[PDB]
From Swiss-Prot:
Residues 4-87, 88-190 form the Ig-like C2-type domain. The chain holds residues 24 to 220 of 597 of the full protein. Induction: Induced on monocyte-derived macrophages by S.typhimurium infection. This is Leukocyte immunoglobulin-like receptor subfamily B member 2. Contains 3 copies of a cytoplasmic motif that is referred to as the immunoreceptor tyrosine-based inhibitor motif (ITIM). This motif is involved in modulation of cellular responses. The phosphorylated ITIM motif can bind the SH2 domain of several SH2-containing phosphatases. It comes from Homo sapiens. Disulfide bonds join C26-C75, C121-C166, C133-C139. It is found in: Cell membrane. Phosphorylated on tyrosine residues. Dephosphorylated by PTPN6. The gene is LILRB2. Expressed in monocytes and at lower levels in myeloid and plasmacytoid dendritic cells. Expressed in tolerogenic IL10-producing dendritic cells. Expressed in myeloid-derived suppressor cells during pregnancy. Detected at low levels in natural killer (NK) cells. Expressed in B cells. It comes from the Eukaryota.
Amino acid sequence: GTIPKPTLWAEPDSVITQGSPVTLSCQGSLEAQEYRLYREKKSASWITRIRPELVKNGQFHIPSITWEHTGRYGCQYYSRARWSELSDPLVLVMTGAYPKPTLSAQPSPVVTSGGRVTLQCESQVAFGGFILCKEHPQCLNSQPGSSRAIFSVGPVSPNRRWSHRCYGYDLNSPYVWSSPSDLLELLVPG
Ligand SMILES: [Cl-]
């Protein structure tokens, strides 16, 4: 016999500026007796149980997010004399840990019809990698380390907003990102 899989949710979001609060809540059944929350920094590595003293009836409130908190979380609860399966994973990212890079389009944010545009994400300090996000933002990463990364984007549709930001990060902390670049809006004429 099984008990329902729990849900793990983050409030206010899964992506949090350094030093800002976030609450991770494991939702078990209403009869849940005990909870275990876990964090993984990378795949097929250690699994850390969040210390029980940090968690109150399944709620891990983080008043001020730090490097240590980032990573992939999962949880389980105990009911009817068994531990549940693990929740679906939740990824917690901290932004704002480095100065923001600059994101620019070449030759310009106006894309040729049917074509693509060259984007440059540039930083004053070298990063292990860069991230391009299109605004639930969808993000891709590229190697530069070095101080800039080049991204191709397109084709761009005439009827849709096409808004991008970029971040830098280091390879040994892939869930800790810079402050985001300013927004870049691409468009095609018409
Ligand atoms: Cl912790």
